[PDB]
Amino acid sequence: ISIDALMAKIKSTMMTREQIQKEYDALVKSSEDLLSALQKKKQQEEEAERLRRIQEEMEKER
Amino acid sequence: ISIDALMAKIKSTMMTREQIQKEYDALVKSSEDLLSALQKKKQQEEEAERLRRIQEEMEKER
């Protein structure tokens, strides 16, 4: 009766909460992947400029 | 740099997802408590009408 309508409403609200959780999870994963790429890019750029300076200090002596 | 802005944005989105999850959890608990009360009320009403009939069948014989 109003029990079965309310059971259906509880099931419908649980699905909405789960689907919204999944969309926010996908926003978080997307931003974290972009963050991971930028952190990697920063490590690579610092790595290269320190190594360039090591070669410049080696070429001054020769 | 844009790394720290993005770390803050990831932290802010995780808080929003958690707070929205909590509000939907409270809608589900609220509907489930109301469902529990109606199911209890239905069991009590069926219980009483069967017991009333048991007393009526006992009083017909006396």
Author numbering:
A (entry chain A), B (entry chain A): 876 to 937
Copy out sentences from the published article reporting this entry, exactly as the authors wrote them.
SEC-MALS with six fragments derived from the 3HB/SAH junction indicated that a rather conserved region (aa 875–940) can self-dimerize with KDApp of ~19 µM (∆G° ~−6.4 kcal/mol) obtained from titration. This minimal region corresponds to the last half of the 3HB (i.e., the 2nd and 3rd helix) and the first part of the SAH. Crystals of the 875–940 peptide diffracted to 2.1 Å resolution. Clear electron density for all residues from 876 to 937 indicates that they form an extended helix that dimerizes in an antiparallel manner. This antiparallel dimerization is stabilized by multiple apolar contacts involving 13 residues from each helix, and six polar interactions involving R892 with D900, and T888 with S906 (via a water molecule). At the center of the interface, the structure highlights how residues T888, R892 and V903 contribute to the dimerization. Three mutations (T888D.R892E.V903D) were introduced into the 875–940 peptide to assess the impact on proximal dimerization. SEC-MALS confirms that the T888D.R892E.V903D mutant stays monomeric even up to 43 µM (peak concentration in the SEC-MALS experiment) while the WT counterpart is dimeric in similar conditions. The inter-head distance is indeed compatible with the large (~30 nm) stepping previously reported when Myo6 walks processively. Myo6 is unique in that its antiparallel coiled-coil and Lever arm in the dimer are derived from the unfolding of a 3HB, with the contribution of the SAH.
Myosin VI (Myo6) is the only minus-end directed nanomotor on actin, allowing it to uniquely contribute to numerous cellular functions. As for other nanomotors, the proper functioning of Myo6 relies on precise spatiotemporal control of motor activity via a poorly defined off-state and interactions with partners. Indeed, while they are back-folded monomers in their inactive form, these motors can self-associate to form active dimers upon activation. TOM1 and Dab2 cannot bind the off-state, while GIPC1 binds Myo6, releases its auto-inhibition and triggers proximal dimerization.
